[PDB]
């Protein structure tokens, strides 16, 4: 890394205002229908969101006891933005090591904890449940069949991207990116705080973004300096953030922090979701960092729409019979 992170945290130059500050009672499906979820949103307060979080003093070791000491986890080497892997017990030990004793900066942003004890301790905002393609489009009996709590692709019965635990030590940086498949992101600061930089996905900015990835000077160019308008903004403890599809963002951690969030495709900015997928195609992103079963899910979205409106099914007889059985529960 060849740019000075501390000036990027100190400058006033990132003074765009893209974020709408909202009350939770107003974040509903009518709002989504009306606005296309195009705008980043901040809920300073969790009222009317329908969220559920763990005990306020929950710790990384608590997380590890719910997901298992031996669960393998993706960790990010901050310095290089490369990925490594260790067990949650090892991660927990790193995280409990004193600041001055930790040789390297490591971040976890990719612990998906569905089908573990932790999963029922966390609930997203309700409105997400009304629009997430996983819930509303994927054949239910497949989703329900999932037993594996890791992200082993071979055991995966649906796109396992709904509930993530992110655990970050003071000093963590995640460089500019767009979430996989153009997914939208909900993001809840349980303990600590985060600083975000936000760039809107105008055609131009997405062009710069892709060019920047293909150039590999990502440690050299702070992408926010390359664009007309960038907003830097702090999330405090108990805030909830929603990031629309395509939004290019980086994130710094000023204090040890615990965050629960997750990713979701929806029916209201499909064009963007496809744009982002195609950028991953072109820049050759490994499958593992992508949204599982992307096109498969898109096929099921089409089938649902035609079925819910016209009442003609394009599912197999067996799949139709599995859905009837669940309708009768």
């Amino acid at each position: 890394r060849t740019f000075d992170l501390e000036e990027k945290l100190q400058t006033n130059k990132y003074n765009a205002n893209f974020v709408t500050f909202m009350e939770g009672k107003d974040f509903n499906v009518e709002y989504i229908q009306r606005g296309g979820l195009r705008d980043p949103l901040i809920f300073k307060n969790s009222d009317g969101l329908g969220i559920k979080m763990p005990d306020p003093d929950f710790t990384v070791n608590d997380v590890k006891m719910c997901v298992g000491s031996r669960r393998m986890v993706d960790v990010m080497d901050v310095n290089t933005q490369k990925g490594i892997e260790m067990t949650m017990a090892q991660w927990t030990r790193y995280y409990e090591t004193p600041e001055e004793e930790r040789e390297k900066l490591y971040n976890v942003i990719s612990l998906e904890f569905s089908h573990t004890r932790l999963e029922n301790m966390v609930q997203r905002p309700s409105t997400v449940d009304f629009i997430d393609w996983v819930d509303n489009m994927w054949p239910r009996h497949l989703k329900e069949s999932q037993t594996e709590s890791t992200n082993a692709i071979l055991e995966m019965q649906y796109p396992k991207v709904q509930k993530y635990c992110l655990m970050s030590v003071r000093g963590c940086y995640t460089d500019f990116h767009v979430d996989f498949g153009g997914t939208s992101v909900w993001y809840h600061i349980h303990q600590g705080g985060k600083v975000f930089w936000l760039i809107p996905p105008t055609a131009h900015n997405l062009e710069l973004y892709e060019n920047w990835l293909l150039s590999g000077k990502q440690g050299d160019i702070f992408l926010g300096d390359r664009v007309s308008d960038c907003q830097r903004i702090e999330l405090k403890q108990g805030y909830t953030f929603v990031i629309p599809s395509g939004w290019i963002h980086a994130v710094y951690t000023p204090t040890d922090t615990l965050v629960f969030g997750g990713n979701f495709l929806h029916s209201f900015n499909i064009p963007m979701q496809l744009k982002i997928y195609s950028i991953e195609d072109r820049t050759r992103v490994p499958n593992k960092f992508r949204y599982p079963f992307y096109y498969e899910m898109c096929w099921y979205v089409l089938e649902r729409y035609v079925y819910c409106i016209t009442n003609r099914s394009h599912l197999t007889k067996d799949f139709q019979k599995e859905s009837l059985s669940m309708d009768m529960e």
Binding site: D74, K82, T150, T174, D175, Q218, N287
Partner: peptide, 13 residues
């Protein structure tokens, strides 16, 4: 060695 999917991470440097 099981292959994974849905790993959140930006590109490397």
């Amino acid at each position: 060695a099981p292959a994974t999917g849905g790993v959140k991470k930006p590109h490397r440097y």
